[PDB]
Write a protein that binds this ligand. Structure first.
Ligand SMILES: CCCCCCCCCCCCCCCCCC(=O)OC[C@H](COP(=O)(O)OCCN)OC(=O)CCCCCCCCCCCCCCCCC
Ligand SMILES: CCCCCCCCCCCCCCCCCC(=O)OC[C@H](COP(=O)(O)OCCN)OC(=O)CCCCCCCCCCCCCCCCC
Ligand SMILES: CCCCCCCCCCCC(=O)OC[C@H](COP(=O)(O)OCC[N+](C)(C)C)OC(=O)CCCCCCCCCCC
Ligand SMILES: CCCCCCCCCCCC(=O)OC[C@H](COP(=O)(O)OCC[N+](C)(C)C)OC(=O)CCCCCCCCCCC
Lengths: 163, 85, 124, 82, 83, 52, 246, 243, 106, 44
């Protein structure tokens, strides 16, 4: 059980699996799946914020090397600072409540598999944007949330003004 | 949801025209009644009732389609043509 | 024809109809077209510099003349910065001294050296 | 008023840059009290009342110093003209 | 609404109103894959995590500052605010 | 829809909705009366800290 | 950071109350001019959106008070002279923060109805999936500031590890240097202007519905985004497309 | 495909292999002329992309703009710029023939006309083609974890070393490369399906095979550019002349 | 420009539909609106008895310019209609069999 | 004076009359004043 990793990995599961298995699982399943997985992400980060008031001792996780070149290294590094946990509890709360909300608000809409998928990747690249521990991972999340905002504002590709 | 019928449009437009003051009578109203001749409406009172009918059905009318609905039956068929209610 | 760059394109065209450029948005929407989304009939001649007069073109507002709207925008801009800059003069003074610091302004605490006391130092 | 803490004691208790003055001696139990609970606002109120009262005393001597500054400006303004 | 759609087209995210008949049966597989992947990646990244503060002992950091001072003395390098 | 151009009926809200309006309504005005009362000298601005 | 925290809970309840009343109208219209009175028909979405609007105007006892009014306090409390000016600017926004919120509480719940009768027959409450997040975020947007204020607004706090320079830090200065007038003033006027916009919307309704030619040009400036989109589109987008066509 | 994936990178190779070893003392005197021409071919070709009626021609001018980014890392006199030009050249050689497949294979074999004005709303009859068109669009711009951004980023950084003011206006290429590409992508992806185009077959297995390979091979370089540093760490140090 | 006729009728009916719709989105209240609309009606009732073409065309384009001064930024549109926000959300795809282009593979 | 005077009456009648339009404006005010009076008297 690793608190710093399940904040990252669980909205990645909640995004990759609605796309790769949406035809196979169906909307009625992928609604409740993406919902409950963001719910347990949100509960894990409340419990971590409760831990972090005990000791102000952040946890980071380290990954492989992005690039080594002469005076410059970039690693994938993920660190929940107090600023990071402040933003993180807010965005996971608003995310999970909007997932539960859009279960019932979108039940007449056709394509809510792709919709709940894109909501979850929006949450996921927001997660990586907040918890990154250099200026590079901040950039990766910073670009891909704009990419999601393309894919989210233009959800009705039929409508001209949305595009 | 909520889906209209033909008789719903009928009893909406009849009650609409019963609310209106410058009609001749509340008793001569039919499905096939001319607004201009049978109801005693001006060139400009038929326009006020086309404004009220388009507000009442929640739908918008261009100027080319507003003049054509001279009788009430043409208005009922025309309002039933659109998907919006 | 109507725009200036459309007139700049005129001596280049040869055996091309040179039709009036009209916005595809400011066509009325209730006339029946072949494509309702394009607002365009099946064989209708496409203008000199079409893609500025497309449905995918700019939004092309119609409620203000553009020179007038330029004036109104720069007017609100200038009135805000002028009002704030003049209101910097009608300001009251404050009632406290800006607060001081021990250990000669914490100069050892914020890095610092005895020769570098002025660059990394506080009020004392 | 509390005594000024030592420079080494500031280094030990890791008090921030802007909190270190002749009142920060009342800060280090407070935060420690704040770490015993989980920063909950109903709890640990006596010590933050202590620290606030110490800071009110600092504020009063700040305002008296600013008052002392305002008299000498008027006095030099009258003395420079005459 | 429930307007009619063509069934010839196949999209990976499902199509218009994708609801297969065995969606509980496939939901069992998807919960298995999701729980197994989450537990496996959470246990795999366990030794790569570390605490932020208190990893190395303070005597090492004071010695590193001392060696920095030695290397800075050898090259005769002034401070920033010395001018 | 039984009437047109005439007086509407009083609506029918279900019992679970109209009790939850009263719970969210009661906890608003109760919590505001708590926080006005417990922070009354600070919130309004009283006992100023300038020396006399 | 504290305002960024509480603001999220606020606005999410605002957008979801708005979507609940757009979803409940059979028209699914968005014009507030065509909503009309819906107070007796939708009491739940009303009590949600009014908790959100009262938090939004920093009415005290809600977390908008604690997030929002202390920034207006800190504009006056700062050391530099020029900050006094933005006090009034931030102050002006707070009064502005009332008035449109009163509009989006008035014309959709209190006013005489504007829509046709059938949507008032078919107006009903939304599902349980729409109701429960609004409930939970109403509770959060009430209690979050009183719970987390010790964390983000202490007399001295060591939670956020950022390092203010010792002179840019004016937080002890700002709490004490406020006169009674400057602190009492945004509270009382954000109350009074809210009740003012309500009571002037019912009883008179001519002050806002004048037909001066000059106020209509001014209103149409402020309607079309302080003509910004036009000043973006014709002079940057369209000129850019012409010079790219050159 | 062989032209825009390999011939342009062959001349990017020839500026390294032939010029930077024995024209060094020349090369320093002339880096501002190269920066004139490089910035002036990034700005003015990517701006001419906006007014295009044809569809393969847009991806052509896109290739011009990316090679214009590429060569100011070569002449940057930096370790970063040389490595960024190589990773740009290899990643553009992946991503760009996939775009020429999307305009030429899936879209000219079916309709035989390349004018942009015919093509609208390709999503509702071909969902997975529209999926490709968007994720190959975003891989072209400089949206990260794709290897195109690693090339663009290290090239712009190396070009900022050698002259900062040329890097300041060189950096707006991230904007200018997004404008025309997403302006094409939303016109192809969205709208009611076109009245001109009758519905045709979905993307076949061979085309999806080519696409999957050319997209994985961008993503591997995007997630970890260190996978080919084992070849270049000699040749990043080789061409540098900092006395 | 012309007395009592069907084309002049079409013009004046179009202008009256305009002036009602135009007044509709300025005014939020029902009561002030229906007062104002009765007034507008009284302005059209005071006219429409004009004999000459000269003063008729004079008042005609004068009230056309008076109609142009009171234009509104966003007209109230119903959402399912081309000014609206529900316009073209899911336009249903037309039923088409697949055209084929290759002899060998789909 | 008003030609649509009998249509536009139901807007001002039973549900949207002025005394009814302000009914659920403060739903839990009457409960919370009693609970706050009880908490006022019970704290001592
Ligand atoms: C401290 C300093 C503070 C400075 C603050 C002042 C900053 C002002 C600068 C603002 C620049 C904004 C960025 C410009 C590029 C934005 C592109 C864009 O957004 O295009 C939008 C356009 C669609 O918009 P539209 O059709 O009008 O409305 C749709 C809603 N239905 O989409 C399209 O139509 C696509 C085709 C047009 C794309 C634009 C082509 C020309 C691009 C020119 C870029 C110029 C960049 C340099 C600007 C210099 C400004 C001085
Ligand atoms: C880390 C790197 C991330 C790499 C992402 C990998 C994702 C691969 C799987 C993407 C598949 C998405 C998909 O299949 O969407 C299909 C969608 C179908 O449209 P639909 O809503 O079903 O309606 C059909 C109407 N006939 O088709 C569409 O309508 C177009 C929308 C596609 C949505 C794509 C979602 C992923 C985009 C990621 C951007 C990556 C940029 C690099
Ligand atoms: C997408 C959701 C995120 C999933 C994250 C799962 C994490 C699993 C545990 C990580 C272990 C680890 O990577 O270890 C790192 C290992 C060995 O490096 P090390 O020195 O031993 O450790 C580093 C820690 N330091 C710094 C403290 C010492 O190198 C690698 O593997 C790199 C292999 C890269 C292959 C090319 C990428 C292929 C991607 C293709 C995609 C289509
Ligand atoms: C400062 C300049 C503001 C004038 C702009 C304006 O035109 O103000 C009018 C607004 C709009 O009012 P409305 O409810 O949308 O009615 C719409 C009816 N129109 C369309 C005829 C206006 O009234 C206000 O709320 C602003 C008055 C309160 C300001 C704070 C005191």
């Amino acid at each position: 059980y690793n608190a710093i990793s399940l904040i990252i990995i669980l909205p990645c599961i909640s995004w990759l699996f609605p796309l790769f298995f949406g035809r196979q699982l169906g909307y009625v399943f992928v609604t409740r799946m993406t919902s409950t997985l963001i719910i347990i992400t949100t509960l894990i980060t409340y419990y971590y914020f409760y831990q972090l008031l005990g000791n102000n001792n952040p946890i980071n996780l380290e990954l492989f090397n992005y690039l080594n070149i002469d005076y410059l290294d970039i690693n994938y590094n993920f660190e929940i600072d107090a600023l990071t946990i402040t933003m993180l509890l807010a965005i996971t709360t608003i995310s999970s409540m909007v997932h539960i909300y859009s279960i019932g608000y979108m039940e007449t809409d056709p394509h809510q598999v792709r919709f709940f998928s894109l909501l979850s990747m929006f949450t996921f690249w927001m997660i990586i944007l907040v918890t990154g521990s250099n200026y590079f991972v901040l950039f990766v999340g910073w670009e891909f949330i704009g990419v999601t905002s393309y894919l989210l504002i233009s959800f009705w590709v039929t409508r001209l003004q949305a595009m | 949801a909520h889906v209209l019928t033909k008789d719903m449009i009928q009893e909406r437009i009849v009650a609409l025209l019963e609310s209106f003051d410058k009609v001749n009578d509340a008793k001569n109203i039919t499905a096939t009644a001319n607004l201009t001749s049978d109801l005693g409406l001006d060139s400009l009172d038929v326009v006020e009732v086309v404004m009220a009918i388009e507000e009442e059905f929640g739908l918008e009318i261009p100027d080319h389609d507003a003049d054509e609905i001279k009788t009430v039956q043409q208005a009922i068929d025309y309002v039933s043509a659109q998907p919006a209610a | 024809i109507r725009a200036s760059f459309d007139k700049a394109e005129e001596p280049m065209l040869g055996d091309y109809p040179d039709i009036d450029p009209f916005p595809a948005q400011l066509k009325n929407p209730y006339k029946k077209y072949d494509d309702q989304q394009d607002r365009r009939n099946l064989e209708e001649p496409l203008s000199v510099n079409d893609d500025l007069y497309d449905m995918w073109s700019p939004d092309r507002f119609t409620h203000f003349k553009n020179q007038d709207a330029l004036k109104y925008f720069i007017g609100f801009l200038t009135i805000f910065f002028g009002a704030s800059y003049v209101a910097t003069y009608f300001v009251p003074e404050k009632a406290a001294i800006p607060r001081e610091f021990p250990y000669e302004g914490l100069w050892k605490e914020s890095g610092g050296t005895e020769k570098s006391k002025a660059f990394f130092g506080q009020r004392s | 008023f509390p005594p000024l803490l030592s420079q080494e004691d500031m280094k030990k208790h890791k008090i921030l840059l802007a909190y270190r003055d002749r009142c920060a001696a009342l800060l280090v139990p407070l935060n420690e009290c704040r770490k015993k609970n989980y920063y909950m606002p109903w709890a640990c109120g006596h010590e933050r009342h202590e620290y606030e009262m110490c800071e009110v005393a600092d504020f009063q001597r700040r305002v008296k110093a600013m008052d002392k500054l305002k008299a000498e400006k008027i006095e030099q303004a009258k003395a420079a003209a005459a | 609404g429930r307007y009619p759609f063509p069934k010839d087209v196949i999209s990976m995210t499902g199509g218009w109103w994708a609801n297969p008949s065995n969606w509980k049966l496939n939901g069992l597989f998807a919960t298995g894959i999701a729980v197994g992947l989450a537990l496996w990646v959470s246990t795999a990244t366990l030794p790569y995590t570390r605490r932020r503060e208190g990893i190395t002992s303070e005597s090492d950091i004071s010695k590193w500052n001392a060696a920095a001072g030695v290397w800075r003395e050898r090259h005769g390098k002034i401070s920033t605010g010395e001018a | 829809n039984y009437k047109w151009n005439g007086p509407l009926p009083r609506p029918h809200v279900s019992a679970g909705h109209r009790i939850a309006t009263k719970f969210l309504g009661a906890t608003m005005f109760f919590w505001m009366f708590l926080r006005i009362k417990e922070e009354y000298p600070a919130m309004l601005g009283l006992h100023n800290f300038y020396p006399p | 950071l504290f305002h960024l925290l509480g603001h999220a809970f606020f606005k999410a309840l605002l957008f979801m109350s708005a979507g609940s009343i757009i979803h409940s109208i059979l028209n699914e219209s968005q014009d507030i001019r065509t909503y009309g009175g819906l107070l007796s028909y939708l009491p739940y979405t009303y009590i949600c959106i009014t908790i959100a609007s009262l938090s939004l105007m920093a009415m005290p006892g809600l977390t908008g008070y604690y997030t929002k009014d202390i920034i207006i306090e800190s504009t006056y409390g700062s050391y530099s002279i020029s900050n006094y000016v933005v006090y009034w600017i931030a102050y002006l926004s707070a009064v502005l923060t009332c008035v449109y919120s009163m509009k989006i509480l008035y014309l959709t719940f209190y006013s005489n109805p504007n829509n046709n009768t059938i949507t008032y027959y078919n107006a009903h409450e939304s599902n349980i999936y729409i109701t429960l997040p609004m409930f939970i975020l109403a509770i959060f947007a009430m209690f979050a500031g009183w719970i987390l204020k010790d964390i983000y607004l202490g007399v001295g706090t060591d939670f956020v590890g950022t390092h203010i320079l010792p002179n840019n830090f004016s937080y002890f200065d700002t709490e004490f240097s406020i006169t009674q007038f400057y602190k009492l003033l945004p509270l009382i006027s954000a109350i009074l202007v809210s009740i003012l916009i309500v009571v002037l919307n019912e009883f008179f309704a001519i002050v806002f519905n004048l037909n001066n030619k000059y106020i209509n040009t001014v209103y149409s400036i402020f309607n079309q985004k302080l003509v910004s989109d036009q000043i973006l589109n014709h002079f940057i987008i369209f000129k850019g497309l012409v010079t790219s066509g050159n | 495909m062989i032209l825009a994936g390999l011939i342009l990178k062959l001349a990017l190779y020839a500026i390294l292999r032939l010029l930077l070893p024995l024209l060094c003392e020349a090369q320093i005197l002339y880096t501002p002329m190269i920066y004139i021409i490089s910035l002036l071919t990034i700005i003015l070709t990517s701006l001419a992309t906006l007014r295009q009626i044809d569809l393969k021609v847009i991806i052509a001018y896109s290739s011009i703009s990316h090679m214009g980014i590429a060569i100011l890392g070569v002449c940057s006199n930096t370790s970063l710029g040389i490595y960024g030009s190589i990773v740009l050249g290899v990643a553009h050689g992946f991503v760009s023939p996939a775009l020429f497949l999307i305009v030429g294979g899936i879209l000219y074999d079916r309709y035989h006309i390349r004018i942009v004005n015919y093509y609208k709303g390709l999503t509702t009859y071909m969902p997975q083609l529209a999926t490709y068109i968007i994720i190959l669009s975003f891989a072209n711009i400089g949206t990260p974890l794709t290897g195109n951004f690693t090339g663009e980023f290290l090239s712009l950084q190396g070009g900022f070393i050698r002259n900062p003011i040329i890097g300041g206006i060189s950096c707006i290429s991230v904007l200018l490369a997004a404008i025309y590409q997403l302006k094409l992508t939303n016109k192809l992806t969205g709208g009611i399906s076109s009245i001109y185009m009758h519905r045709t077959n979905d993307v076949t297995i061979r085309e999806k095979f080519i696409m999957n390979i050319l997209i994985i091979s961008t993503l591997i370089i995007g997630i970890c550019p260190q996978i080919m540093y084992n070849l270049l760490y000699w040749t990043v140090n080789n061409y540098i002349y900092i006395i | 420009p012309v007395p009592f006729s069907a084309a002049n009728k079409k013009l004046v009916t179009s202008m009256y539909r305009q002036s009602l719709k135009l007044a509709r989105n300025w005014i939020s209240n029902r009561q002030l609106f229906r007062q104002k609309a009765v007034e507008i009606r009284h302005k059209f009732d005071q006219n429409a008895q004009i004999s000459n073409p000269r003063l008729l065309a004079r008042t005609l384009d004068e009230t056309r310019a008076h109609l142009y001064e009171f234009r509104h930024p966003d007209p109230i549109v119903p959402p399912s209609f081309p000014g609206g926000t529900k316009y073209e959300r899911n336009v249903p795809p037309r039923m088409e069999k697949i055209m084929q282009h290759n002899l060998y593979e789909p | 004076k008003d030609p649509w005077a009998r249509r536009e009456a139901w807007r001002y009648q039973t549900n949207f009359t002025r005394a009814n339009r302000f009914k659920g404006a403060a739903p839990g005010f009457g409960i919370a004043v009693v609970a706050f009076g009880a908490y006022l008297a019970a704290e001592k």
